[PDB]
Design a protein around this ligand. Structure first.
Ligand SMILES: NS(=O)(=O)c1nnc(NC(=O)C2CCCCC2)s1
Ligand SMILES: [Zn+2]
Length: 257
């Protein structure tokens, strides 16, 4: 089964998921000097006030916080998007060291981690149908750098001890994902894919230009999670990031000058 190790990592994924070598794979390097400001791009609308978080879960590749997406409660609109995209879950990708961990890169710079808030287009009715559409999902990507603590992340960090290994989950209600956002909603956007299998080419990527800072203690707690399930040889959940993929016939647009 797929993972991030030598024998099951990103270089192997194409064998089970041939779209791994497709025309709109993610992540990508964002070359800031080649990205073009698109004045027709609207501001992002991040409407998270009614977000209803449900569970936090270690799925063996990351940890994710899931939300009630059965109604328009936490939605992403605007920017490059047509229509309404419901927040389903967020998760992170991170490194074994502070100089790697992000999936997208900016002028080849790797951040310590990357937060993905995964949303799906309500015109497709459910996320499984949305994954089958080229405009089915919108992932809001936010870089993490190590510096000062992010207070809105602490509640996540506080609970990771309870989901150390693959398959463990915990109640994670009343979590406000607005606490994970940077000040600026300036973004780059491009059409891409899920960065984990099945690598479906269904994502409008919206990557914020402003990172959030998290503390060394916060990221260290990410790195104490396990890829393995309980009772198996302990393999720390670190470096669960896919590297940048070929941009191919795509233009990255910037919402800002
Ligand atoms: N790293 S990422 O591009 O944000 C992602 N890679 N696979 C992702 N799968 C999902 O979100 C789903 C969750 C539930 C049902 C379908 C899909 S999200
Ligand atoms: Zn992700």
């Amino acid at each position: 089964h797929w993972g991030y190790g030598k024998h099951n990592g990103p270089e192997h994924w194409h064998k089970d998921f041939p779209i791994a070598k497709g025309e709109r794979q993610s992540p990508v390097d964002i070359d800031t000097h080649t990205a073009k400001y698109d004045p027709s791009l609207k501001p992002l609308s991040v409407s998270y006030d009614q977000a209803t978080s449900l569970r936090i879960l270690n799925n063996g590749h990351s940890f994710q916080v899931t939300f009630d997406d059965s109604q328009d409660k936490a939605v992403l609109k605007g920017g490059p998007l047509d229509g309404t995209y419901r927040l389903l879950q967020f998760h992170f990708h991170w490194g074994s060291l502070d100089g790697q961990g992000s999936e997208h890169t900016v002028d080849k710079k790797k951040y310590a981690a990357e937060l993905h808030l995964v949303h799906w287009n309500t015109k497709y009715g459910d996320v499984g149908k949305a994954v089958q559409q080229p405009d089915g999902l919108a992932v809001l990507g936010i870089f993490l750098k190590v510096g000062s603590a992010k207070p809105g992340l602490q509640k996540v960090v506080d609970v990771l001890d309870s989901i150390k290994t693959e398959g463990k989950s915990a109640d994670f209600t009343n979590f406000d994902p607005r606490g994970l956002l940077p000040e600026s909603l300036d973004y780059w956007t491009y059409p891409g894919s899920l960065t984990t299998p099945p690598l479906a080419e269904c994502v409008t990527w919206i990557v914020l230009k402003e990172p959030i800072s998290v503390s060394s203690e916060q990221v260290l707690k990410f790195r104490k999670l396990n890829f393995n399930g309980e009772g198996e040889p302990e393999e720390l959940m670190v470096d669960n990031w896919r590297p940048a993929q070929p941009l191919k016939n795509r233009q990255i647009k910037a919402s800002f000058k």
